[PDB]
């Protein structure tokens, strides 16, 4: 049973507990939110998939392609507790809940065990200028100024050229990086990648 | 633990594991990280 959980629902209905919508927020509180209020289904922008699909259009994130380039940050859409027309059932009957949520230890092995045992987690790392140009390989910060913290999805690990890495999913579409994925140095708490791992177990109901 | 692990191979029956979203012009990555991993785990922990 695979459901595409709506980012929109999370971004817009989590109040100030999550932070401030499009002006960034708190990963850990996002997990908590799902535990308390749950989350509906919702696919990609203008997919008509699920109850609350994403309403902010895609763009070109530091790359060239057909899409207009990402503007910066815009407006946080409104929390509307109703499903898009054409979707059945009700908003409330579409809610998916968490049993729990917890922080994973700043430890390579703990993070490895968690993924292996329960699946992809969420982490965050500080983004430096050289990161934007990521194409392939294992990312390692050398040059460039800092930009900020950036939450991501860690779903695996490996070693390349004896350089161990974390397999991560970015949300800058598929035409950024390696078909939307990147690899970053592991075991050195690089760019703070093993520092803010959070996960949780769904509610089999 | 294995030397290499890729959730996308381990759980091919969960299509969300391979999916790439777009947060667009918004600092919502905190939410994407979340609903992406949540999507995945629902599929993993369910029959």
In whole angstroms, the N-to-C terminal distance of chain A is 12 Å
Please summarize the sheet with the most strands of chain A. Answer: 5 strands, mixed
How many H/I helical runs of chain B? Answer: 2
Q: Going by CATH, what is the homologous superfamily of chain A?
A: Cysteine proteinases
- Total count of strands of chain B: 1
Active site (chain B): 29
Organism (chain B): Homo sapiens (Human)
Disulfide bonds (chain B): 14-43
Protein name (chain B): Cathepsin B light chain
Give the SSE layout.
The complex is a heterodimer of chains A (205) and B (47).
Chain A: H1 7-13, H2 27-36, E1 102-103, H3 108-118, E2 121-128, E3 138-139, E4 146-160, E5 163-169, E6 181-185, E7 198-199
Parallel strand pairs in A: 3-6
Antiparallel strand pairs in A: 1-7, 2-4, 4-5, 5-6
Chain B: E1 5-6, H1 7-10, H2 29-45
Provide a concise account of the structure shown.
The complex is a heterodimer of chains A (205) and B (47). With 205 residues, chain A is α+β, with helices and mostly antiparallel strands. Chain A contains 3 helices and 7 strands.
What would the keywords be for this entry?
heterodimer; A: alpha+beta; Cathepsin B, Chain A; five-stranded mixed beta sheet; two-stranded antiparallel ribbon; globular; B: 47 residues; mainly alpha; 2 helices; hydrolase; cathepsin; cysteine proteinase; dimeric; Cathepsin B
Q: How would you portray this structure in words?
A:
The complex is a heterodimer of chains A (205) and B (47). Chain A contains three helices and seven strands; from the N terminus they run H-H-E-H-E-E-E-E-E-E. In chain A, strand 4 and strand 5 form a beta hairpin. Chain A has one domain: Cysteine proteinases (Cathepsin B, Chain A). The longest helix of chain A has 11 residues. In chain A, strands 2-4-5-6-3 form a five-stranded mixed β-sheet, covered by helices on one side. Chain B is mostly helical. Chain B has one domain: Single alpha-helices involved in coiled-coils or other helix-helix interfaces (Up-down Bundle). Chain B contains two helices and one strand, in the order E-H-H. The interface between A and B is large, with 76 and 43 residues. Strand 4 of chain A pairs antiparallel with strand 1 of chain B. Chain B: This is Cathepsin B light chain.
């Amino acid at each position: 049973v695979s459901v595409e959980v709506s980012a929109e629902d999370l971004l817009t209905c989590c109040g100030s507990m999550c932070g401030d919508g499009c002006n960034g927020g708190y990963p850990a509180e996002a997990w908590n939110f799902w535990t308390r209020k749950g989350l509906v289904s919702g696919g990609l922008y203008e997919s008509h998939v699920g109850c609350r699909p994403y309403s902010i259009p895609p763009c070109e994130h530091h790359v060239n392609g057909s899409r207009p380039p990402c503007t910066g940050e815009g407006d946080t859409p409104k929390c509307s507790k109703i499903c898009e027309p054409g979707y059945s059932p009700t908003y409330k009957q579409d809610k998916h809940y968490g049993y729990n949520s917890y922080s994973v230890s700043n430890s390579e092995k703990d993070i490895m065990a968690e993924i292996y045992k329960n699946g992809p987690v969420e982490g965050a790392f500080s983004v430096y200028s050289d990161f934007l140009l990521y194409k392939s390989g294992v990312y390692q910060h050398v040059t460039g100024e800092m930009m900020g913290g950036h939450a991501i999805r860690i779903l695996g690990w490996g070693v390349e050229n004896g350089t161990p890495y974390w397999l991560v999913a970015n949300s800058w579409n598929t035409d950024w990086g390696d078909n939307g994925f990147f690899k970053i140095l592991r075991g050195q708490d690089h760019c703070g990648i093993e520092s803010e791992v959070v996960a949780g177990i769904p509610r089999t109901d | 633990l294995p030397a290499s692990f890729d959730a996308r191979e381990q759980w091919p029956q969960c299509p969300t594991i391979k999916e790439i979203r777009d947060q667009g012009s918004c600092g919502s990555c905190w939410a994407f990280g979340a609903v992406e991993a949540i999507s995945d785990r629902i599929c993993i922990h369910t029959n």
